[model samples]
Target: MSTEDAMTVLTPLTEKDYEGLKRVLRSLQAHKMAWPFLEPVDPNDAPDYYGVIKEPMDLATMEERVQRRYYEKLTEFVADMTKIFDNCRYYNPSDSPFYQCAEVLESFFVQKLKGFKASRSH
Candidate 1:
């Protein structure tokens, strides 16, 4: 396989990348609209939540994953973050507060990731 292909398959996150991930996570958790995603959605509040979102995600879970080193690559970390917004939009209507939060947070996340990646492109 080509070197680029090999790199793609085996690119574990470096120390700098890990720090960047933490920075992004910290900013996301601090966002004003992040209240709903701070913890997992309670089934008691929404009985159909578990059924509708097969893969639920939240900021607290991501924090635990980081502590446990659950993500070997940056893509895995990004995937979990995206799932939070995607799951939110999937379960909530556009007019709902949850959906609006997800919309704003998704944009914030994308911009953060973009700037982070740019800084790493040395």
Candidate 2:
């Protein structure tokens, strides 16, 4: 199958679903602001959630530029995420600071198209 065809087969969220998700994400942001003190009882603690996303490419077909681009992208993403965790280290469970951080992280996923698409296209 062609790459586009394979993408269509595996991508679960349609364009409409993506739009809907954007709306829901806004609502989530508003809700978090309204209830700033209520936090998730159990927070995810993983420091670096890095993993390979793409199918292994044949060496003959893998362009060095593409490989370098993705490597740099992943490295930058991890660096930013590490900063988030550093901020989270001082988070207090009672004040729901982590919820706000979580919202920021989720927004980062949505707003950063390159990283978001790279991970999703895997």
Candidate 3:
């Protein structure tokens, strides 16, 4: 390993990269606390959600984006994934299911990303 290894190049995700991304997404979707994040919150149920959360994201939307190859860079997908957790915490109280779920899932996702990066660094 050399000092230059500290600065990894940022390139677009390849087919193999997307495969890894999909695996992580599927694992996240299968998590026990993933129910609330699987689909978008309904405006009728929570009218304030749209007003408070300028941007909303969910697993379903992420899956669709993956299908369309909307994310050229891995960071884009990471941003959207983190946004879901942030949006949940922003709108819901800490004691609320949504907030708590996000907290757990965020931790879980971060760990998975760490492992994913390690595997890819090779």
Candidate 4:
């Protein structure tokens, strides 16, 4: 969302509401701790990586025949974000499930995008 639109919606709320929104934006890891069911310190457990090309692509050109299907991989990654939110609901009602993890990733992409935009901008 545009910064202006965000300000429009967020301005002049109760201090508690404002702080809660910012914390949610910033601390997904912290938010996960609010529920015991979500506890486990394996930060790498999210579906964050694809399998390496190991047909023994280098050693696997002999081990397996193929690596991953491009379209299927794409679809699964897209849907995996939805899964995070679904899990939040399964754990508890009134959860802002997807946004926390989604924003963590969004922050990564936004930095890349900003660099790209800055390079291309006058």
Candidate 5:
């Protein structure tokens, strides 16, 4: 299936709420992105990668629940943001970079989710 088709959408929140949500999301995304690059070290050796990427767990249920919740929250945020942009009377689709910025944010979410799932499964 296509990537987007595989995702689940949740509740709808406002644009400002979406922005707030993004702050938390960005942090989570960064953590997930850096997880894989972490190097494992012996206790005797100096800790590398700041001790990220610890032991793995069987999170089949946890993963499913977390993914569902995040998807719902993200969908709401996107809907609100889209509404706000649509209502911007002075908004110039071609003159502003905001649209591109939003797109980047969405892409990051998708990439982070995919990466996390892959890592968890492996």
Candidate 6:
């Protein structure tokens, strides 16, 4: 087989799944707002419960860049994962220890991919 065909074929992972994973992670949010405006409380009415979205004034651009690290790291993690478990040879339990070691390592990664896929699918 050609070098391109040397790697074993696997499924349940794709950039489409990456986008779904992105949606899952992107749903979480964290942001800060400015000082709350006091509505002159009556002689000590129940302590005011501030209700507003506060966005920090300064460092917004910096904050956006920092917050984007998750996407950067996810991209890196996905790329690195693609480089693994390719061109591998499978082994049976009765094989030599080295072969079993390879089998277990391959299984670990395969199961992880399944979990990642499973995580998003359900």
lDDT of each: 0.86, 0.38, 0.86, 0.33, 0.39, 0.34
| Stretches of model 6 off by over 4 angstroms after superposition | 1-79, 87-100
Clashes of each: 0, 0, 0, 7, 2, 3
Query: Model 3's lDDT to the true fold?
Result: 0.86
Candidate 6 structure quality by residue, lDDT tens digits, 1-122: 53212211333335565565444323211211111111121224323312221121112322343345433433344443322222112211345443353355545545554555555445
> Residue 58 of candidate 1: its Cα lDDT?
98
> Measured by TM-score, how close is model 2 to the native structure?
0.25
- How far out, in Å, is residue 34 in model 3? 0.3
Off by over 4 Å in 4: 1-72, 95-122
The TM-scores of all predictions, comma-separated, are 0.88, 0.25, 0.91, 0.23, 0.29, 0.26
Best by TM-score: 3
- Per-residue lDDT of 1-122 in model 1, one digit per residue for the tens? 74433433467877877788889999999999999999999999689999889999999999999877888876788889999999999898899999999999999998998777666554
Note the residue pairs that clash in candidate 2.
none
* Tens digits of per-residue lDDT for model 2, 6-77: 543454554543543344334443543323212312234332322221122211221232333332333333
After superposition, candidate 2 runs with Cα above 4 Å error? 1-71, 103-122
Q: Where is the poorest 10-residue window by lDDT in model 4?
A: 54-63
- Winner on TM-score between 1 and 2 is 1
How big is the positional error of residue 43 in model 2, measured in Å on the Cα after superposition? 26
Candidate 6 collision pairs: 32-54, 33-54, 33-55
lDDT of 3 by residue, 1-122 (tens): 53223312366778888898899999999999999999988999588889889999999999999988898877788899999999999888899988899999999999988777776777
State the lDDT at 5 in candidate 5.
Answer: 30
Instruction: Give the candidates in order of TM-score, highest first.
Output: 3, 1, 5, 6, 2, 4
Give the Å error, residue 99, model 5: 0.4
In model 1, which regions exceed 4 Å deviation?
1-10
